[model samples]
Target: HAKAFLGLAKCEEEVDAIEREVELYRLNKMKPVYEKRDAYIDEIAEFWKIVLSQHVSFANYIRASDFKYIDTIDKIKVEWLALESEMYDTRDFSITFHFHGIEGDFKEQQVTKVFQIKKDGILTSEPVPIEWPQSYDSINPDLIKDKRSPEGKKKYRQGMKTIFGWFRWTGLKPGKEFPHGDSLASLFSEEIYPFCVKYYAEAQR
Candidate 1:
């Protein structure tokens, strides 16, 4: 395996080396940058060959410059700024990855079909949206919307019970039929929804 010769973890170190090469595209001559990045990408391709072995088919090389990957990042930034007024919020933002189902398994076959690092759930130095909310639950529907209302509280509790019942009978309760813990629920506040919606709206294009 190239990684064994390279003496590194399969993806982690390989990705780090690739990113540094990607960064060089900014510093040195453009031709060298293109050539070196392509070379490193080729090296990565070889690494994958070793990693994947007989698990899948290897596709032809796909160069980032040819695919305009960098351009897409710029475009996402521009679109976000253009539509951010709808959210009426301020924070650093960056796109996140949405890998295929094989993420946890780390099957090398998935790499051939993966999207951009940020778009493929790869770790990145890229910034992400943030806000100065006091707490994650500050925007909880019961609290900010109407926690003190007796009738509203009753409705909320009953609504939760009904949802739990539906989930229980549907074979979706944690530990019994499902294995996920508390992390299954959406943790982001309502405040983050607008940004996410705006991102998806522009991202689909």
Candidate 2:
């Protein structure tokens, strides 16, 4: 059984490579690799927003892939930088990041439940339930109250700046709104929408 022998050899080779990578991480021998890994975590966050808006279903699939990516990142964080004597320790170290992929899935599951089905030769997509954050209005009281006064205008500008900074890397084109649903829609509203418009305009310039 030559084929079977080759298959086992290949499997063992891959496992050996994985163990080598783990050993490298344990020795603190991969700082640059770790830095790039951290950068990727940030990149994936922006990519999640962009894809989720355009194709909700596809975004969920992308998010599923991210679950695996996060597992790797988590492993790296937990297993990296350890003493040789402790390499085989089985202690559980909790991951600090929520990874947000679950939050995205939570939104998708709730939203997709309300999307339209074929009926009466017409299609209609209903708005789904959203759990808004309670502290949204508190973020900028002046803008919520009145945008005409000096204090209100100042806060309005500040709020716009915040939104722009949040989505700067999304790469959305000018004049097109980055669709927001669920908590994002509720948490960022009214002034936030116009602020996005302003930001998109300036970003392209």
Candidate 3:
């Protein structure tokens, strides 16, 4: 029935044209504010950690050990890709994680993931290695913590297999259809990173 509505296709064309205008405004108008926000927040104490720990989507996935890496989180930056080019995409972007080096032998100061649009419009990304030292292996236990527990409780321990499981997420793994891939792209760019101050405040009270 919706396909029978011939005017809808024409509306979509114009709307897409405006999408470019909106993207230009987003990069020009919104991005400048984001730059200032990143600088301003850098001075604040453990702002990103508090935001990540308190976020609804990620709060539960965070394990007890996650804080070790989470605290080391220096800054997380999201850069939206080329929407102006017909070949490129809008949501296609890269998230770079900057870590503060300490005694942990965490070699990678910056671990970045690029969410790219594939030939068939499928979103994909390659997992960036954390380069955490072998001695730090115990931090991430592969066996589910509290496995002898309820579904709701076990979900919290789900991602502890990797150094920082969320950090290891690229897109979907082979045969797995989990949403942790592109879901995180929107979770951060659309919501968390943009309104982190609010989440930080939420964490406080």
lDDT string, candidate 3, 1-205, tens digits: 6775778888988998899778866776777788888998899778888898788886544455556777778798988776435556776777888878557455548888778777627677776666564444444434335545675244434443333555555565743323355665668777887789899998888
How far out, in Å, is residue 57 in model 2? 19
Q: Considering every candidate listed, which one attains the maximal lDDT?
A: 3
Please tell me which model should have the higher TM-score, number 2 or number 3: 3
Q: Is candidate 1 or candidate 2 better by TM-score?
A: 2
The CA lDDT at 28 in model 3 is 62
Prediction RMSDs, each to the true structure:
19.9, 19.2, 5.8
Task: Give per-residue lDDT, candidate 1, residue 18.
Answer: 75
Question: Candidate 3's error at 2, in angstroms?
Answer: 10
Name model 2 segments beyond 4 Å from true: 1-27, 46-78, 81-96, 101-205
Give me the overall lDDT of model 2: 0.34
Candidate 2 to truth, TM: 0.21
Question: In model 1, which regions exceed 4 Å deviation?
Answer: 1-6, 10-14, 23-145, 148-205
> Which one is best on TM-score?
3
Pairs that collide in candidate 2 are none
